[PDB]
Amino acid sequence: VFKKVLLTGTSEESFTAAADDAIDRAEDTLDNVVWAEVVDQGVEIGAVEERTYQTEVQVAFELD
Amino acid sequence: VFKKVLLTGTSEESFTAAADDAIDRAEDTLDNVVWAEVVDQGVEIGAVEERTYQTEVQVAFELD
Amino acid sequence: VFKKVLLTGTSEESFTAAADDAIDRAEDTLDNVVWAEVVDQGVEIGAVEERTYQTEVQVAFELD
Amino acid sequence: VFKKVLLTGTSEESFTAAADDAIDRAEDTLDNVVWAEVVDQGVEIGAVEERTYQTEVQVAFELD
Amino acid sequence: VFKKVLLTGTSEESFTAAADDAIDRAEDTLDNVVWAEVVDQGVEIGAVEERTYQTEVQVAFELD
Amino acid sequence: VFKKVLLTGTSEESFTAAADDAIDRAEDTLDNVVWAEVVDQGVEIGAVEERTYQTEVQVAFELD
Amino acid sequence: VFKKVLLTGTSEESFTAAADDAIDRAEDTLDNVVWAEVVDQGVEIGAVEERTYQTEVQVAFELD
Amino acid sequence: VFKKVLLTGTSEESFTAAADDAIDRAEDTLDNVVWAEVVDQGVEIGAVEERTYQTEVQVAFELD
Amino acid sequence: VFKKVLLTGTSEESFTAAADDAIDRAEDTLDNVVWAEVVDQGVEIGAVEERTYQTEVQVAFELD
Amino acid sequence: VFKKVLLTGTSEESFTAAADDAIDRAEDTLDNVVWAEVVDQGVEIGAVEERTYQTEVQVAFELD
Amino acid sequence: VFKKVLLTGTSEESFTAAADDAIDRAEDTLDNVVWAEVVDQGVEIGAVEERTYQTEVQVAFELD
Amino acid sequence: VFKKVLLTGTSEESFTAAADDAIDRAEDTLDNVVWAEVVDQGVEIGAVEERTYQTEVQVAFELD
Numbered sequence: 149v150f151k152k153v154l155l156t157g158t159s160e161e162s163f164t165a166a167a168d169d170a171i172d173r174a175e176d177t178l179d180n181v182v183w184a185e186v187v188d189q190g191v192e193i194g195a196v197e198e199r200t201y202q203t204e205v206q207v208a209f210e211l212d
Numbered sequence: 213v214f215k216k217v218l219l220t221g222t223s224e225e226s227f228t229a230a231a232d233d234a235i236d237r238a239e240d241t242l243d244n245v246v247w248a249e250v251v252d253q254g255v256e257i258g259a260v261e262e263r264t265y266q267t268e269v270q271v272a273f274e275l276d
Numbered sequence: 277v278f279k280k281v282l283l284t285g286t287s288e289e290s291f292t293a294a295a296d297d298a299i300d301r302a303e304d305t306l307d308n309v310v311w312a313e314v315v316d317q318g319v320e321i322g323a324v325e326e327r328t329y330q331t332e333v334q335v336a337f338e339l340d
Numbered sequence: 341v342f343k344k345v346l347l348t349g350t351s352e353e354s355f356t357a358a359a360d361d362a363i364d365r366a367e368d369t370l371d372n373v374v375w376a377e378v379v380d381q382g383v384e385i386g387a388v389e390e391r392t393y394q395t396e397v398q399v400a401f402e403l404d
Numbered sequence: 405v406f407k408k409v410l411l412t413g414t415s416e417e418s419f420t421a422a423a424d425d426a427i428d429r430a431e432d433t434l435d436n437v438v439w440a441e442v443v444d445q446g447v448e449i450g451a452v453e454e455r456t457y458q459t460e461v462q463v464a465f466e467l468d
Numbered sequence: 469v470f471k472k473v474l475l476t477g478t479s480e481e482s483f484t485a486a487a488d489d490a491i492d493r494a495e496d497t498l499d500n501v502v503w504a505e506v507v508d509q510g511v512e513i514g515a516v517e518e519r520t521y522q523t524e525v526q527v528a529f530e531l532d
Numbered sequence: 533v534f535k536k537v538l539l540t541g542t543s544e545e546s547f548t549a550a551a552d553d554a555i556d557r558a559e560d561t562l563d564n565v566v567w568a569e570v571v572d573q574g575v576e577i578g579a580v581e582e583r584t585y586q587t588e589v590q591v592a593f594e595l596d
Numbered sequence: 597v598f599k600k601v602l603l604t605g606t607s608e609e610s611f612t613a614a615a616d617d618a619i620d621r622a623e624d625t626l627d628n629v630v631w632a633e634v635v636d637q638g639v640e641i642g643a644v645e646e647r648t649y650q651t652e653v654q655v656a657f658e659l660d
Numbered sequence: 661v662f663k664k665v666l667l668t669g670t671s672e673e674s675f676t677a678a679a680d681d682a683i684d685r686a687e688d689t690l691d692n693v694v695w696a697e698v699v700d701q702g703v704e705i706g707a708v709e710e711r712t713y714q715t716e717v718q719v720a721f722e723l724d
Numbered sequence: 725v726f727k728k729v730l731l732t733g734t735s736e737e738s739f740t741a742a743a744d745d746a747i748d749r750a751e752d753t754l755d756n757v758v759w760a761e762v763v764d765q766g767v768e769i770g771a772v773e774e775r776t777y778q779t780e781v782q783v784a785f786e787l788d
Numbered sequence: 789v790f791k792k793v794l795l796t797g798t799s800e801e802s803f804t805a806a807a808d809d810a811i812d813r814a815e816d817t818l819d820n821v822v823w824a825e826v827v828d829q830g831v832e833i834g835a836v837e838e839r840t841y842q843t844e845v846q847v848a849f850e851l852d
Numbered sequence: 853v854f855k856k857v858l859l860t861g862t863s864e865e866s867f868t869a870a871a872d873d874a875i876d877r878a879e880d881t882l883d884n885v886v887w888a889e890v891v892d893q894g895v896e897i898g899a900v901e902e903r904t905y906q907t908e909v910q911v912a913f914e915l916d
């Protein structure tokens with residue numbers, strides 16, 4: 149059985165790095181992270197010093 | 213990093229109040245709730261005394 | 277077996293009340309109305325005296 | 341010919357009132373506003389004093 | 405309030421049995437599982453001995 | 469001209485049999501049922517003795 | 533209150549004429565047909581003498 | 597950079613001609629119109645003398 | 661078993677004729693073309709002498 | 725690099741077996757079939773002796 | 789009230805840089821640009837010297 | 853007439869480079885590749901040495 153958690157990563161560099169940011173967080177607290185599916189991307193502009201890229205992923209991990 | 217939990221709030225009054233019901237629950241058990249996105253709305257009719265409005269939200273909260 | 281009918285309710289007050297308007301109509305002519313799913317919302321503005329909120333629902337009822 | 345503008349209204353009270361907020365703004369600056377279609381709803385929580393309901397609408401107006 | 409968890413069940417027999425596999429897992433660790441919604445189905449072919457059917461479900465459970 | 473009715477079939481056995489349940493019902497009351505399109509699947513769990521599979525279909529029938 | 537019926541019109545000439553075919557049928561049996569929304573288009577090729585264009589519409593009519 | 601405007605054209609003749617109606621309007625007031633994407637089609641029936649076909653397009657134009 | 665190929669037809673006349681253009685091409689090189697499903701429509705404007713209507717279809721053909 | 729082909733399998737027994745029918749066909753003519761994603765399901769009723777279940781899959785295979 | 793404009797940025801380097809290209813343009817002519825949502829990505833290949841990445845964004849800005 | 857093939861490119865570096873990987877493959881075996889549309893992105897994590905970014909594209913090429 150796989151379970152997914154819906155995480156939004158951020159990065160001041162790129163959409164790819166914002167995906168990695170979410171995946172890094174999942175791997176910090178979850179065992180057996182197997183894949184991620186991009187479900188949304190955006191950019192925070194007027195509440196941040198630099199533009200922040202965001203990539204939202206469903207991060208899948210195998211249960212047990 | 214933001215994480216979302218997928219909650220359905222209920223209310224006998226309105227769709228807005230059913231959204232608040234889910235958000236209240238998230239704020240009970242989660243720190244740093246930042247926003248909610250409506251993903252579905254419905255009404256329970258024939259298993260309840262009064263019509264119950266339901267609003268399903270992805271409730272986003274900042275990790276750490 | 278459940279069947280759905282696709283109804284748009286209207287109200288000069290709110291989206292919730294426009295949903296109720298469609299559900300009321302379904303309950304007038306159908307037995308065993310069990311639930312409704314919101315599929316669209318809109319507002320009629322320039323052909324009405326007051327803004328009219330509209331909520332379109334799939335209203336489910338149990339057959340037999 | 342109709343044209344649509346994509347507006348997000350806000351309200352501290354309800355999703356219906358947040359729709360009205362966007363429609364009010366369209367009627368301030370546009371002639372012949374005829375209808376609005378709800379395309380999204382959400383709630384701002386952790387950057388506001390009170391929860392703020394948001395309703396995003398495509399507001400249609402007749403050209404000429 | 406209902407909460408959903410996004411689980412992918414697997415089975416070497418059928419899509420229905422892969423749904424049951426996810427639901428079984430939810431019932432192992434969650435109280436008050438009330439319903440599941442199918443959101444995706446697939447088949448793993450070239451990394452398994454036998455084809456494995458997969459059914460991804462949002463499994464809803466009542467909070468409290 | 470074809471018309472569709474939106475029916476949810478149920479079964480304690482499988483998604484396929486729940487589709488048949490809706491189609492059987494359509495064929496009971498309609499002439500010239502030609503095809504069905506699956507639009508949703510789910511499982512009722514916590515209000516039934518046994519899990520009940522549900523398959524929602526648009527059942528198409530030729531008018532005249 | 534508006535209700536919609538989901539009809540597929542056919543024509544050997546065009547998608548527009550296939551829409552009219554469904555609308556004609558609705559106007560034959562329904563009072564107060566107000567609008568139609570195109571939801572799908574297709575072409576039947578290998579079971580017909582000539583290609584047949586099909587346009588599927590939700591045909592809306594005002595109740596009462 | 598391209599920008600899109602969301603226009604609904606109308607015609608008493610066809611969906612193609614309703615698309616042209618929106619595109620004509622865009623070309624009246626915009627320079628460098630490059631393409632259009634159909635996003636919706638419908639028919640106005642019960643508020644017009646003759647059925648009116650409508651085609652909604654995102655009309656893209658190159659900025660500068 | 662049916663297979664689909666994803667083709668975009670073009671025409672200087674209409675969306676229907678652009679669908680036929682793709683279907684003609686499929687029938688040139690494929691046996692047993694049975695149906696087509698419209699998946700997108702658009703208009704090329706600023707790189708062509710005359711506006712070109714485009715209709716994208718999944719063209720289904722029976723294998724064997 | 726993976727490539728997908730869009731196949732509809734059929735079966736007089738079940739949706740799972742109709743998926744297998746498409747996958748079998750892909751494995752007949754393609755090397756390195758790795759997975760399939762269900763994209764649609766339906767039932768042919770009024771042109772067949774027995775109801776025929778259909779499952780449409782994107783069948784993925786590794787190139788080279 | 790927020791308003792969105794639908795812009796496609798281009799870049800010969802990356803999808804992230806194509807998003808920035810659209811956002812830069814919005815910030816050139818609009819005050820209070822607050823966020824952008826990615827709605828599509830593509831690559832222009834056979835009408836350009838080098839591949840051009842494109843990222844289409846809804847760019848949101850606060851009115852007033 | 854344009855035809856599309858549905859390819860998933862991979863890269864250990866970025867989503868943009870994974871798109872290029874699919875496009876490179878299409879240009880290896882196809883003449884007149886004109887554009888690509890991103891339809892999905894993901895990351896393979898727990899079956900690879902390094903995270904692998906994947907970008908799925910519909911790659912369009914002109915027939916003849």
Ligand SMILES: Cc1cc2nc3c(=O)[nH]c(=O)nc-3n(C[C@H](O)[C@H](O)[C@H](O)CO)c2cc1C
Nearest residue numbers: 190191192193194195382384387822823824825
């Ligand atoms: C993808 C994305 C979507 C956003 N959507 C909203 C929104 O709908 N409403 C909103 O108030 N702020 C939104 N924001 C945040 C906005 O940019 C700003 O930080 C907040 O408005 C401050 O309260 C969004 C930010 C991002 C990156």
Ligand SMILES: Cc1cc2nc3c(=O)[nH]c(=O)nc-3n(C[C@H](O)[C@H](O)[C@H](O)CO)c2cc1C
Nearest residue numbers: 254255256257258259310311312313510512515
């Ligand atoms: C939005 C919504 C969707 C529902 N969908 C279903 C359904 O698909 N099948 C079902 O058995 N009950 C459904 N119900 C519950 C139904 O109204 C009733 O309470 C149950 O059927 C009792 O078992 C739904 C209720 C709501 C509010």
Ligand SMILES: Cc1cc2nc3c(=O)[nH]c(=O)nc-3n(C[C@H](O)[C@H](O)[C@H](O)CO)c2cc1C
Nearest residue numbers: 318319320321322323374375376377638640643
């Ligand atoms: C949600 C919604 C969508 C509508 N869409 C259309 C449309 O696409 N075309 C149209 O002519 N009128 C549309 N109208 C009606 C419009 O506001 C006006 O009453 C009619 O144009 C009068 O013929 C719509 C109204 C609502 C509430």
Ligand SMILES: Cc1cc2nc3c(=O)[nH]c(=O)nc-3n(C[C@H](O)[C@H](O)[C@H](O)CO)c2cc1C
Nearest residue numbers: 190192195246247248249382383384385386387
């Ligand atoms: C519907 C909605 C969606 C939002 N989405 C985002 C988002 O994707 N990323 C983000 O940083 N903030 C988002 N926000 C804003 C967030 O709540 C907060 O105000 C900002 O993060 C401050 O920078 C959103 C707000 C709303 C109301």
Ligand SMILES: Cc1cc2nc3c(=O)[nH]c(=O)nc-3n(C[C@H](O)[C@H](O)[C@H](O)CO)c2cc1C
Nearest residue numbers: 446447448449450451758759760761894896899
């Ligand atoms: C529904 C489904 C979707 C999949 N999608 C992907 C994918 O996008 N990329 C991938 O590398 N593997 C995918 N796989 C796994 C693939 O079949 C194989 O096991 C892995 O490629 C091994 O690394 C998928 C498997 C299933 C069942």
Ligand SMILES: Cc1cc2nc3c(=O)[nH]c(=O)nc-3n(C[C@H](O)[C@H](O)[C@H](O)CO)c2cc1C
Nearest residue numbers: 254256259438439440441510511512513514515
């Ligand atoms: C596919 C599916 C969806 C459902 N969705 C809802 C829902 O949104 N809200 C709800 O109260 N019950 C829902 N139910 C019914 C739920 O399981 C239970 O029977 C009712 O909550 C009893 O009132 C659903 C059941 C099914 C099978």
Ligand SMILES: Cc1cc2nc3c(=O)[nH]c(=O)nc-3n(C[C@H](O)[C@H](O)[C@H](O)CO)c2cc1C
Nearest residue numbers: 574575576577578579694695696697766768771
């Ligand atoms: C838009 C459209 C979709 C169709 N889809 C299917 C299908 O999924 N399966 C099928 O057997 N026939 C389908 N057909 C019918 C097919 O062309 C042929 O008439 C039947 O296969 C005969 O049994 C479709 C026809 C049209 C116009």
Ligand SMILES: Cc1cc2nc3c(=O)[nH]c(=O)nc-3n(C[C@H](O)[C@H](O)[C@H](O)CO)c2cc1C
Nearest residue numbers: 318320323566567568569638639640641642643
């Ligand atoms: C595509 C389309 C959608 C429409 N949707 C609506 C609607 O949701 N509600 C409505 O009142 N009128 C709608 N209308 C307008 C309706 O036909 C009639 O002109 C108005 O109801 C008059 O107020 C629509 C018209 C078209 C062409």
Ligand SMILES: Cc1cc2nc3c(=O)[nH]c(=O)nc-3n(C[C@H](O)[C@H](O)[C@H](O)CO)c2cc1C
Nearest residue numbers: 630631632633702703704705706707830832835
């Ligand atoms: C439906 C449609 C969509 C198009 N989308 C794009 C696009 O996203 N980017 C682009 O550069 N050109 C696009 N074009 C082509 C554009 O009109 C023009 O021919 C090219 O920009 C020349 O390089 C599109 C054309 C059509 C018909």
Ligand SMILES: Cc1cc2nc3c(=O)[nH]c(=O)nc-3n(C[C@H](O)[C@H](O)[C@H](O)CO)c2cc1C
Nearest residue numbers: 502503504505574576579766767768769770771
């Ligand atoms: C999923 C599915 C969808 C279909 N859609 C259509 C359709 O849109 N139009 C049609 O003529 N036949 C359709 N058919 C075929 C229909 O049942 C019948 O075999 C044909 O109408 C014979 O020409 C479909 C069949 C299936 C299984």
Ligand SMILES: Cc1cc2nc3c(=O)[nH]c(=O)nc-3n(C[C@H](O)[C@H](O)[C@H](O)CO)c2cc1C
Nearest residue numbers: 702704707830831832833834835886887888889
């Ligand atoms: C995302 C994207 C989508 C496009 N879609 C189309 C299309 O549907 N039809 C078309 O003629 N050109 C399209 N083009 C443009 C195509 O690559 C080429 O520049 C034009 O065909 C020249 O007229 C598209 C380009 C991009 C980047």
Ligand SMILES: Cc1cc2nc3c(=O)[nH]c(=O)nc-3n(C[C@H](O)[C@H](O)[C@H](O)CO)c2cc1C
Nearest residue numbers: 182183184185446448451894895896897898899
């Ligand atoms: C976007 C993406 C989606 C995937 N989906 C699935 C899936 O649904 N089921 C699965 O078994 N593996 C999936 N995988 C593959 C998974 O990560 C792992 O390699 C396989 O499970 C090994 O059999 C996917 C991989 C990617 C990159």
Ligand SMILES: [Cl-]
Nearest residue numbers: 154218410462
């Ligand atoms: Cl989710």
Ligand SMILES: [Cl-]
Nearest residue numbers: 346398602794
């Ligand atoms: Cl828009």
Ligand SMILES: [Cl-]
Nearest residue numbers: 282474526538
């Ligand atoms: Cl329907």
Ligand SMILES: [Cl-]
Nearest residue numbers: 666730782858
């Ligand atoms: Cl495809």
